[PDB]
Amino acid sequence: AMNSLFASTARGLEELLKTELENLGAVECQVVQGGVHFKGDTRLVYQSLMWSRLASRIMLPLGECKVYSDLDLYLGVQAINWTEMFNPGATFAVHFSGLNDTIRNSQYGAMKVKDAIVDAFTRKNLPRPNVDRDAPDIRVNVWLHKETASIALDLSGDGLHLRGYRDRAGIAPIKETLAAAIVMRSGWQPGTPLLDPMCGSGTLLIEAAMLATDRAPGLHRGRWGFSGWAQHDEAIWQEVKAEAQTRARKGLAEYSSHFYGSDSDARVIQRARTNARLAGIGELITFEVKDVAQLTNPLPKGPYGTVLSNPPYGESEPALIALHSLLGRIMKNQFGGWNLSLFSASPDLLSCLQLRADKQYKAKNGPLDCVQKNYHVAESMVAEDYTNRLRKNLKKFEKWARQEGIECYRLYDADLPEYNVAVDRYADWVVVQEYAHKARQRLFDIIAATISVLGIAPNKLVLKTREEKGEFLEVTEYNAHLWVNLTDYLDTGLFLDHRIARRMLGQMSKGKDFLNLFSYTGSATVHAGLGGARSTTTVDMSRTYLEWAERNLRLNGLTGRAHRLIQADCLAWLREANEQFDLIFIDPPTFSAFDVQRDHLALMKDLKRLLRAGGTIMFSNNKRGFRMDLDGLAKLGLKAQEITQKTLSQDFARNRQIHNCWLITAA
Ligand SMILES: Nc1ncnc2c1ncn2[C@@H]1O[C@H](CSCC[C@H](N)C(=O)O)[C@@H](O)[C@H]1O
Ligand SMILES: Nc1ncnc2c1ncn2[C@@H]1O[C@H](CSCC[C@H](N)C(=O)O)[C@@H](O)[C@H]1O
Numbered sequence: 001a002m003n004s005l006f007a008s009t010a011r012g013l014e015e016l017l018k019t020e021l022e023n024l025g026a027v028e029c030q031v032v033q034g035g036v037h038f039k040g041d042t043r044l045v046y047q048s049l050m051w052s053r054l055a056s057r058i059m060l061p062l063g064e065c066k067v068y069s070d071l072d073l074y075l076g077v078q079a080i081n082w083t084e085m086f087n088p089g090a091t092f093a094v095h096f097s098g099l100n101d102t103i104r105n106s107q108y109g110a111m112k113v114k115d116a117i118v119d120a121f122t123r124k125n126l127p128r129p130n131v132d133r134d135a136p137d138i139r140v141n142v143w144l145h146k147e148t149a150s151i152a153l154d155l156s157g158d159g160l161h162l163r164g165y166r167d168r169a170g171i172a173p174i175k176e177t178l179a180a181a182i183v184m185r186s187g188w189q190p191g192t193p194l195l196d197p198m199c200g201s202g203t204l205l206i207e208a209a210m211l212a213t214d215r216a217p218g219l220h221r222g223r224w225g226f227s228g229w230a231q232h233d234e235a236i237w238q239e240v241k242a243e244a245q246t247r248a249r250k251g252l253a254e255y256s257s258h259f260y261g262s263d264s265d266a267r268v269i270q271r272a273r274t275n276a277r278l279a280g281i282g283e284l285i286t287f288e289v290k291d292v293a294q295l296t297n298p299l300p301k302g303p304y305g306t307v308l309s310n311p312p313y314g315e316s317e318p319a320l321i322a323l324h325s326l327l328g329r330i331m332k333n334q335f336g337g338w339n340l341s342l343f344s345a346s347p348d349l350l351s352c353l354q355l356r357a358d359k360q361y362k363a364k365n366g367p368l369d370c371v372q373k374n375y376h377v378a379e380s381m382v383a384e385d386y387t388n389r390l391r392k393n394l395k396k397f398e399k400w401a402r403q404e405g406i407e408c409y410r411l412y413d414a415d416l417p418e419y420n421v422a423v424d425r426y427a428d429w430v431v432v433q434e435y436a437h438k439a440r441q442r443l444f445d446i447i448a449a450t451i452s453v454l455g456i457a458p459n460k461l462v463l464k465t466r467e468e469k470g471e472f473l474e475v476t477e478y479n480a481h482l483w484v485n486l487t488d489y490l491d492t493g494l495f496l497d498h499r500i501a502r503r504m505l506g507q508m509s510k511g512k513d514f515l516n517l518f519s520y521t522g523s524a525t526v527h528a529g530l531g532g533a534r535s536t537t538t539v540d541m542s543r544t545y546l547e548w549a550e551r552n553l554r555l556n557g558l559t560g561r562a563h564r565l566i567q568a569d570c571l572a573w574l575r576e577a578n579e580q581f582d583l584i585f586i587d588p589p590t591f592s593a594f595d596v597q598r599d600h601l602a603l604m605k606d607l608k609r610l611l612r613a614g615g616t617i618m619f620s621n622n623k624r625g626f627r628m629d630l631d632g633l634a635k636l637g638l639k640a641q642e643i644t645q646k647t648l649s650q651d652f653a654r655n656r657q658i659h660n661c662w663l664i665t666a667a
Contacts, residue, residue, distance in 0.1 A: 001041060001042060002039055002040070002041060003039060003040060003041065003042060003044070003045055003060065004037070004038075004039055004060075004061055005026075005037070005038050005039065005040070005045060005048065005058060005059065005060060005061075006035055006036070006037050006038070006058070006059050006060075006061055006152060007021065007035055007036050007038065007048065007052060007054075007055040007056075007057070007058045007059075008034055008035040008055065008056045008057045008058075008059075009034065009035060009036070009054050009055055009056055009177065010034075010056065010175075010177065010178060010363070010364065011033065011034055011364065012361075012362065012363050012364065013054050013177070013178070013181055013363075014031040014032070014033075014034070014035065014036055015031060016054055016181055016184060017031075017035075017036050017052070017054040017055060018030075018031050018036045018038075020052060020053065020054055021036060021038050021048060021052065024044075024047055024048060024051050024052070025040050025043075025044045025047055025048075026038040026039065026040050026044060026048060027039050027040055027044075042233055042236055043236050043239070043240065045058075045060070045155065046226075046233075046236055046237050046240040047240055049155055049156065049160075049218060049224065049226070049240075050216050050217070050218035050219075050240050050241070050244055051216055051217065051218065051244075052160065052217065053176075053177065053180035053207070053211065053217045054177050054180060054181060055156075055160050055177065056156075056159055056160055056161065056177055057141075057154060057156045057159060057160060058154075058155050058156050058160065059141055059152040059153060059154045059155055059156070060152055060153040060155055061150060061151070061152045062080050062140075062151045062152055062153055063076070063079055063080055063150075063151050064076075064148055064149060064150040064151065065079070065148065065149055066147050066148060066149075067100060067102055067103065067144060067147060067148070067149045068102060068147070069102060070102065070112055072102075073102075073103070073109070073112055073113065073116070073149060074112065074115075074116045076149060076151070077112075077113050077116035077117060077151065078116055078119070078120055080151060081120075082117050082120040082121070083120050083121055083124055083126060084230060085138075085153075085229060085230050085231065086129060086138060086228065086229070086230065087137070087227075087228050087229065087230055087232075090129060090137040090138050090228035090229075091129060091130050091131065091132035091135075091136050091137050091138070091228070092114075092117065092129055092130075092131060092132070092136045092137065092138040092139070092140065092228075093114075093131055093132060093133045093136035093138075093139055093140070094110045094113045094114045094117070094131075094139075094140045094141075094142065095110065095139065095140070095141050095142070095154075096109040096110040096113060096141075096142045096144070097141075097142070097143055097144065098143055098144035098145050099144060100144055100146070100147060103144060109142070109144065110142075113140065113142060113151075114131065117129075117140070135223065136228070137225075137227060137228025137229075138153070138225070138228040138229060139153070139154035139157060139225050140152070140153060140154065141153075141154050153225065153229065154225045155224065155225045155226045156224065156225055157223050157224045157225035157226075157227075158221070158223060160177065160217065160218075161175045161176040161177045162176070162221065163176055163210070163217050163218070163219075163220055163221060163279065164219075164220030164221045164222055164278070164279075165206065165220060165275050165276075165278035165279040165280075166201075166275055166278075172201060172203055173200060173201070173310075173365075174200075174203055174204070174310065174343075174365060176203060176207060176217070178363065178365065179203045179204050179207045180207040180211065180217075181363070182204060182308075182310075182341075182343050182363075182372055183204065183207050183208045183211060183308070184211075185341070185359075185361050185372055185374075186306060186308050186339070186341035186372070186374065187306065187339045187341060187359070187374045188208065188305070188306040188308060188339065188341065189305075189306075190208075190211065190212035191212065191255075191256070191257050192257055192303055192304065192305040192306065193257055193258055193259075193260070193298075193299055193303065193304075193305030193306075194208050194257075194258075194259050194260070194305055194306055194307075194308060195259070195260040195261070195262075195298075195305065195306070195307050195308070196259075196260070196261045196262075196307070196308050196309045196310075197260075197261075197262045197263075197290070197292050197295045197307070197309060197327075198262075198263055198264075198292060198309045198310065198311055198312070199261035199262060199263045199268075199269075199272055199287070199309070200263060200268055200272070200310065201268055201271055201272055201275060202261050202271075202272030202273075202275050202276055202285070202287065203275070204308055204309070204310065205259045205260075205261045205272075205276070205285055205308075206275060206276050206279050206281065206285075208259065208308070209259050209276070209279070209281040209284050209285055210279060210280075210281055212251075212255060212257075213248065213251030213252045213254075213255045213281060213284065214247045214248065214250070214251035215247075215248045215251055215252070215279070215280060215281060216244040216247070216248065218244065219244050219245070219248055219280065220278070220279065220280060248280065252280070252281065252283075252284075255284060257305070258284060258285070258286065259284055259285035259286070260285070260286050260298055261285060261286070261287045261288075262287065262288045262289070262290040262295070263287075263289065263290070264289065264290070264291045264292070265289075266289045269287050269288065269289045272287045273287050292323060292326065292327055292330070293326060293330075295327075295330050295334065296334060297334040297335055300334075302337075304335075304337040304338045304339070305338060305339070306338060306339035306340065306341060307331065307335055307338055307339070307340045307341070308340075308341045308342075309341075309342055309343070310342070310343040310344065311323065311324065311327070311342065311344055311349065313344055313345040313346035313349060314346055314349070316440075316443070316444075316447075316463050316465060318447055318451060318458040318459070318461040318462075318463060319458040319459055320346075320349055321349070321352055321444050321447050321448050321451070321458075322448065322451050322458040324349045324350065324351075324352035324353055325352040325353070325354070325448040325451075325452070327353060328352065328353030328354045328355055329354075331353070331355070331377045332377060332378070335377055336377055336378060336379040336380050337377065337378075337379045338377050339374065339375075339376065339377075340355065340374065340375040340376070340377055341372060341373070341374045341375075342372065342373055342374075342375075343363075343370055343371075343372040344370060344371060344372075344373075345365070345368045345369065345370045347371050347373075347437075348437060348440050348441055348444060349444075350371075350373055351441045351444065352444055352445075352448055353375070354381075354382060355375040355377065356375065357373035357374060357375050358374060358375065358376060359373065359374045360372065360373045360374070361373075382445070382448070382449060383419065383445045383446065383449050385416060385418070385419065386416060386419040386445075386446060386449050386450075387449050387452075387453060389412070389415055389416055389419075390411065390412055390423070390449070390450060390453045391453050393411055393412050393415070394411060394453060394454070397409060397411060397650070397651055400650055400651075401651075404478075405478050406477070406478070406499070407425075407426070407427050407475060407476055407477070408424070408425065408426045408427065408475050408477060408484075408494060408496055409424070409425055409496060409649075409651045410422060410423070410424050410425075410496060410497070410651040410652055410655075411423040411424065411425050411430075411454075411651075412450075413651070413652065413654060413655050414435065415654065419446055420434075420435050420436045421433065421434055421435060421436075421443075421446055422435070423450055424492075424496065425454075426473060426475050426484055426486065426492065426494075427473065427475050427476075428456075428460060429460050429461075429462065429473060429486055430450065430454060430456055430460060430461045430462070431461075431462045431463075431464060431486050431492065432446070432447060432450060432461065432462070432463055432464070433464040434463070434464065434465050434466045435466070436466065443463075447461070447463065462486045462487055468487070468488035468489075469488070470485075470487060470488065471485070471487075472484065472485050473485070473486060474555070475494070477494070477499055477502065477503075477523070477527075478499075478503055478506075479506075479530055480502075480506075480523065480526045480527055480530060480556060481526075481555045481556055482494055482521075482523055482526060482552055482555070483521075483548065483551055483552055483555060493520075493521045493523075493548060494521070494523055495520070495523075496649075496651070496652075497649060497651075497652040497655065497657075497659055498587070498620070498647070498659055499649055500646070500647040500648070500649055501524075501585075501587075501618060501620055501643075501647045501659075501661050502523060502524050502527045503527060504618070504647070505524055505527050505528050505531070505583065505585055505618060506527035506528060506530060506531035507531060508531070508583055508616065509527070509528045509529075509531030509532055509533045509583060510531060510532035510533075511532055511533075511534050512528070512532075512533055512534060512581075512582035512583045513533070513534055513535050513537075513579075513580070513581040513582050513583070513612070514528040514529075514533040514535070514536045514537070514581060514582070514583045514584075514585070515536075515537045515539075515581040515583070515584045515585070515610065516528070516536065516537070516538045516539065516585045516586075517539050517570045517573075517574070517584070517585070517586040517588070518539075518540060518570055518586065518587060518588040518589065519538045519539055519540045519545070519546075519549060520540060520542075520545050520549075521545050521548045521549050521552055522538045522540075522545075522546075522548070522549025522550070522552050522553060522565070523552060524585045524587070525538045525549065525552070525553060525558075525563075526552050526553060526555075526556050526558070528583065528585070529553060529556060529558040529563065530556055530558070533562075533583075534562065535562045535563070535564070536553075536558070536562070536563050536564070537564045537565075537566065537579075537581070538553075538563075538564065538565045538566070539565070539566045539567075539568060539570055539573055540567065540570070541567065541568065541569050541570070542567075543567055546565050546566075546567055549565060550565055553565075570588070571593075571594060571599075571603075574603065574606040574607070574610075575606065577606075577609075577610055578610075579610065580610060580611070580612040580615075581610060581611065581612060581615060582612050582614070582615045582616075583615065583616055583618075584607060584610065584611060584615065584616070584617040584618070585617075585618050586603065586607065586617065586618070586619050586620075587618075587619070587620040587621065588603075588621060590621060590622060590623040596621050596623050596626070597623055597626060597627070600619075600621075600628075600629065601629050601632040601633070601636075603619075604617070604619070604632075604633060604636060604638060604664065605636055607664075608636055608637075608638060611666075613666070614666075615665070615666075616663055616664065616665050617662075617663070617664040617665070618661070618662070618663060618664075619640075619661075619662045619664055620647075620659060620660060620661040620662065621659070621660055622657050622658065622659045622660070623660075624656075624657070624658065626658075626660050628640060628642075628660075628662065633664070634667060637666065637667045638664050638665065638666065638667055639664070639665060639666075639667045640662045640663070640664045641662065641663045641665075642660070642661070642662055643661045643662065643663055644658070644659070644660050644661045644662075646661075647659070647661045
């Protein structure tokens with residue numbers, strides 16, 4: 001006999017499958033979407049079941065028909081000689097994929113086929129065979145495409161990816177058949193060291209070890225689809241089985257190289273170790289619990305080999321960027337001369353390695369697009385532009401900030417126009433704020449470089465992207481304690497560039513009645529309050545920012561009747577108000593119905609009504625090119641002394657946005 005077979009595989013693997021079938025004897029192989037049709041004699045059927053590492057399932061087409069009625073399928077199914085095919089007492093199951101105008105539901109199709117099969121027994125007065133979906137002895141597949149159903153015996157039984165070293169469920173993050181592909185694409189030469197420092201369940205390393213010691217994927221499988229079937233040939237199966245034993249033993253006894261796996265998670269490593277032991281190859285592989293950060297080359301004196309792995313992906317994250325960036329640095333340092341292959345769902349994260357891949361492959365892993373890329377690591381740059389600038393600013397501002405008593409400040413303010421980003425330090429945290437795949441990888445480089453210059457821990461870096469759950473952070477500004485939130489708002493709750501105007505209010509405050517309009521989180525009120533203000537009044541339209549202001553006042557012991565918070569539109573509040581204040585801070589947005597340039601004079605007109613004799617208004621804004629109407633003011637009997645230069649902090653000295661600042665008083 002010449003038999004006709006079909007092997008299914010994952011899309012993308014078909015050509016690799018066909019070569020593997022050919023290498024083991026198969027003839028007339030033709031790739032097709034999701035599989036390979038092939039031929040060989042009966043030893044060849046058994047040899048492909050035992051030996052194929054890429055096949056998901058191997059089956060035997062039994063026939064095919066057109067399906068234009070429940071009847072056609074029924075007739076079509078009964079053409080095949082079931083009663084003679086089943087061993088006595090064999091259980092069965094039917095899996096049916098695909099649909100047409102008559103079989104509009106798959107489970108329906110599986111049902112009609114199952115019924116047609118049972119009816120081959122009824123019509124010959126035989127005991128009806130039972131179904132066992134869990135572990136049938138006979139599995140029948142049918143594939144319906146366009147108008148044709150194709151029926152086939154599944155010879156694999158369980159999927160061929162189960163090699164007998166795991167759990168039949170299971171759910172591996174990478175199927176065994178895909179992991180064997182990855183090893184084949186990796187450039188890894190069997191017989192040279194292989195290492196995976198993020199090894200998970202160890203699957204990559206176990207497939208590799210089995211491939212390299214000629215250990216058949218089938219060697220340890222406990223069950224096959226051919227055992228319930230009458231045409232089965234035990235003596236040929238026995239001969240394939242004994243050929244497998246012989247080759248495994250020699251493969252193992254002769255292998256002289258080694259496999260190294262490591263992973264940070266102690267649970268997976270215990271599973272990796274039991275898996276490998278059950279694969280038969282456990283003596284060839286060493287697993288340890290170890291972070292990529294302490295990765296070392298166990299063979300510093302050679303021979304070179306391959307580092308093969310499947311890193312975590314963004315399931316933008318600073319921790320991932322840092323993990324990829326450090327891996328590249330460790331490759332270069334520890335594994336010069338070696339081959340590197342990586343399977344990832346994030347090409348952008350692979351770019352953080354700072355290596356150029358000389359080969360790549362696309363593969364689906366379930367629903368996810370992944371790539372595998374291979375690289376050569378040279379024997380014995382990185383936005384050095386930004387790096388040097390940032391190391392400079394760091395030396396400069398760290399010292400300046402220590403002298404001034406400042407712990408939140410701007411480390412970098414788009415100083416180089418090709419690295420157009422702000423980096424703000426808040427105590428032990430850092431926020432990088434973007435302004436600007438090409439783009440994304442440049443951003444990643446900036447993040448890697450900034451994590452590396454600062455010596456900061458990745459989880460303490462927050463990325464605010466060009467494109468709200470959690471936590472507030474307590475910070476100081478000279479003597480104020482303030483709450484910030486680095487992630488949930490467009491801003492952090494503290495406008496850092498205005499710290500000096502804030503410190504000044506605090507010096508001008510002793511026994512003063514203070515008013516703060518457009519107060520935001522009330523940081524200026526906290527400075528006034530701690531300067532001995534006799535009462536503070538803090539106003540803003542936002543209930544959230546007023547709650548946050550109150551929490552800031554509370555943080556510095558400023559509670560009770562003397563410290564008020566008022567939710568209002570500040571302009572209508574100004575129209576109607578009567579009380580008087582000695583010190584007034586008003587620092588509005590440029591627009592909100594309100595226009596600072598247009599309306600400032602009319603604010604000063606109302607503010608005048610509220611300013612107690614001898615009092616001062618500190619007015620500020622950040623409208624670009626703002627013009628103070630000095631004539632309007634003098635007409636109101638007010639004068640204005642610009643203090644903009646005196647209130648400029650060093651960390652913001654080169655910034656475009658100018659925060660203009662004025663002391664207004666009685667003429
Ligand atoms: N910093 C670090 N050092 C070492 N291992 C890490 C790490 N960060 C994450 N990991 C590990 O990286 C792994 C990525 S998932 C690996 C899946 C694996 N190839 C398989 O076939 O089963 C996880 O096991 C996680 O524990
Ligand atoms: N018409 C209006 N009346 C009252 N508050 C307003 C407003 N329009 C905007 N605001 C508030 O103005 C603030 C702008 S942020 C101003 C910065 C703030 N003065 C500080 O010292 O930190 C926000 O808190 C916003 O809610």
